[PDB]
Amino acid sequence: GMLTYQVKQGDTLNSIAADFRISTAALLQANPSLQAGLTAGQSIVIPGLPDPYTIPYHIAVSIGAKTLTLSLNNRVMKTYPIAVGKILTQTPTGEFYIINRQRNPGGPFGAYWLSLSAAHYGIHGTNNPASIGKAVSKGCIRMHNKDVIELASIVPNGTRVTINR
Amino acid sequence: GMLTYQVKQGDTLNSIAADFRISTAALLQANPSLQAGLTAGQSIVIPGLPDPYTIPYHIAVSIGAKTLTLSLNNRVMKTYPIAVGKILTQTPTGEFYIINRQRNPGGPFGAYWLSLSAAHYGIHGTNNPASIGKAVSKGCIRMHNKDVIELASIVPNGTRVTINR
């Protein structure tokens, strides 16, 4: 299948390409309709990704509880503690997808980086384990290295991530 | 005119793509043999970028001086005060390039974001002007909004960025 994205107010061709880590050229090639511009509500396809609804895994993040919940077929498997965005640089809310990943990025990013479908944002490890469970990040979601590693080993690219208050 | 990159030990396709902000598909399209095997010491081309050799501008960053210096044809043109990373979350050193740019992504990133050829690192403005001139960031280079706007209007993608202690 394919990943369908719905255009939101204030999206541009460039910003959408950016959120999904692809070139605008590739986005246009996959969506000839986009030659004529964008409109809020418009469904388009993001190339390179499977249909997220066909992936039985689902990730729910709660900013208030500082948790990331992994479900398989709407049954919780595992709850993890996480760090979230500080008060003036919060973790965005809404529906996202894991888009790509890099193993062992190191530094403050720890054992793994999993890109989310919002530019500059992802789920990553940490080299500051004391930060986990606190609102101290500049926006990304931080996990213990062992947790992000386990997480990455299970969920494939395209996995739904729902971030709530 | 093409940007060439010499592959390093430990480099993978994912980590190279992440550094240069392109999909693995775009990297492979420009280098059709890499999926059979990446080879340290070999050169590959990064698509979407001009040969940096051709760009007469050059940026020098001094972490100790907290300055970013723009040269043109090897003469200093402008020196800007910056914020750099804390002791535990350092601005990385070495040779980089400006890869891409986003106008007014707002929030903590201020009036502009310019990607550097190291994943998750960039030069950007700020909603916190008081931080400029200090080692207080998470590794990114911060400039006043007015200064990064000026910088971005001047240098093209592919401009060499040299970062020293």
From Swiss-Prot, chains A, B:
Outline the subunit composition.
Monomer.
Q: Where is the LysM domain?
A: 3-46
Q: Which gene encodes it?
A: ykuD
| GO terms for biological process, alphabetical | cell wall organization; peptidoglycan-protein cross-linking; regulation of cell shape; sporulation resulting in formation of a cellular spore
* Pathway(s) annotated for this protein in UniProt: Cell wall biogenesis; peptidoglycan biosynthesis
Q: What else is known?
A: Regulated by SigK. Could also be negatively regulated by GerE. Transcribed by SigK RNA polymerase.
Q: Cite the L,D-TPase catalytic domain residue spans from the record.
A: 57-164
Taxonomy of origin reads: Bacteria, Bacillati, Bacillota, Bacilli, Bacillales
Which positions are catalytic residues? 124 (proton donor/acceptor), 140 (nucleophile)
**Name of this protein:** Putative L,D-transpeptidase YkuD
Role according to the record: Probable enzyme that may play an important role in cell wall biology.
Give the UniProt family note: Belongs to the YkuD family.
Protein EC: 2.-.-.-
Localization per Swiss-Prot or TrEMBL: Spore wall
What does its UniProt record remark on the domains? LysM domains are thought to be involved in peptidoglycan binding.
Question: Can you provide one Gene Ontology molecular function annotated for this UniProt record?
Answer: peptidoglycan L,D-transpeptidase activity
> Organism, per UniProt?
Bacillus subtilis (strain 168)
Write down any Gene Ontology CC term. spore wall
Write down the InterPro entries for this protein, in alphabetical order: LD-transpeptidase (IPR050979), LD_TPept_cat_dom (IPR005490), LysM_dom (IPR018392), LysM_dom_sf (IPR036779), Transpep_catalytic_dom (IPR038063)
Which top EC class is named for this enzyme in its record? transferase
Q: Which UniProt keywords apply?
A: Cell shape, Cell wall biogenesis/degradation, Glycosyltransferase, Hydrolase, Peptidoglycan synthesis, Sporulation, Transferase
